[PDB]
Each structure stands twice: as structure tokens, then as C-alpha cells.
């Protein structure tokens, strides 16, 4: 078990931590969402398909600088909706091929009343997400570290 970004950068067997950039709309109003799909970027594959099948989770997933000053958030994992940042590590995702699939979360971000001018600043850490994975073979249990980062300032309107 691996994962890649588009990007693209690795986290090999074993786990380990890497960053992500992501492209966020220039201005967002009280009232709506940022949606930030990692499904584009990130995806993982089980590499003995045949004999293992790979258990992944979101362990947890934690704000940071101008989403956590000034946004309230939700997290959708494979389906289901969570509070974001998390309050439990999620339920499982099974990986069973070679091929790449998607990590399937996406955060919907929305600006709290007190946000207005550069809510997020351009190239600063707004989040990190955790992926657990495990398996049906044996002790492994490993952490993906994704640190997030924005591309682009955001701007809430006054
Ligand atoms: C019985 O014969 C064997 C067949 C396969 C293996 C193996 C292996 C590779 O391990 C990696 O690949 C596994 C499957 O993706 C992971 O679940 C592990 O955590 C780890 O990342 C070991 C023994
Ligand atoms: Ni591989």
C-alpha cells in the first residue's frame, strides 16, 4: 500500500508525510462553501490484491492559520459527512487493486462571521489529514501524513 498525488509527489510503503498545494476560489461570501476534493490529488493502491486487502480510514483531520481562525468546516469521507476538524477517526475504505483509486475527502469550508479581507493567505498550511491504513494480513499499521496548503489568497468579502 502507497499513495501518489497528481502533482506528484510519494509517501512509499511504510507511510510517511508529504505536501499538498490546492487551488481555492479567490473570494467566498458568508453563506458558502469552499469545497476542497483531495480525490483529485491524492490516490493510493494495494499492492497484493490477491492475498491482502487494505483497510483505510481518515484518522483525523485538523485545521490550521486562516481556516482555523476563520472558517467552520465539515468533511465528506467516502459518502458520509463529519465534522471538520474531526472529532473520531472515521470508517473504513477497502483498497483491493493495483490500480489507483482516490482517497475519497473532500472539505467544505464556510466563513464564520467574524472573517473579512484575506481570510487565507497564499501559500500557507490550512490543514493536515491523516490516512490510517491497515490490513487483513498482518500487524501493519501505518500513517499518510498530507499536509495542506493553499495556493491562492481568499478574500471574504465586508
Ligand atoms: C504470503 O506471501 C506474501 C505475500 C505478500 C506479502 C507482502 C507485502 C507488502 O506489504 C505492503 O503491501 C500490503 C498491501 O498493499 C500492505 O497491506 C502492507 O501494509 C504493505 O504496505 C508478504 C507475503
Ligand atoms: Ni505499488
Redesign the pocket.
Given at each position: 500500500?502507497?499513495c501518489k498525488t497528481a502533482n506528484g509527489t510519494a509517501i512509499p510503503?511504510?507511510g510517511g508525510s508529504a505536501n499538498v498545494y490546492v487551488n481555492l476560489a479567490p473570494v467566498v461570501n458568508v453563506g458558502q462553501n469552499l469545497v476542497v476534493d483531495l480525490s483529485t490529488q491524492i490516490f493510493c493502491?494495494?499492492?497484493?490484491?490477491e492475498?491482502?486487502?487494505?483497510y483505510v480510514t481518515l484518522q483525523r483531520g485538523s485545521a490550521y492559520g486562516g481556516v482555523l481562525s476563520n472558517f467552520s468546516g465539515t468533511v465528506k469521507y467516502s459518502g458520509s459527512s463529519y465534522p471538520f476538524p474531526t472529532t473520531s477517526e472515521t470508517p473504513r475504505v477497502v483498497?483491493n487493486s493495483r490500480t489507483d483509486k482516490p482517497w475519497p475527502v473532500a472539505l467544505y469550508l464556510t466563513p464564520v462571521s467574524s472573517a473579512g479581507g484575506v481570510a487565507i493567505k497564499a501559500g500557507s498550511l490550512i490543514a493536515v489529514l491523516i490516512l490510517r491504513?491497515?490490513?487483513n494480513?498482518?500487524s501493519?499499521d501505518?500513517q499518510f501524513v498530507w499536509n495542506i496548503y493553499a495556493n491562492n489568497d481568499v478574500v471574504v468579502p465586508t
Open positions: 500500500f502507497a510503503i511504510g493502491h494495494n499492492d497484493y490484491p492475498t491482502i486487502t487494505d483498497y491504513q491497515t490490513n494480513y498482518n501493519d501505518f
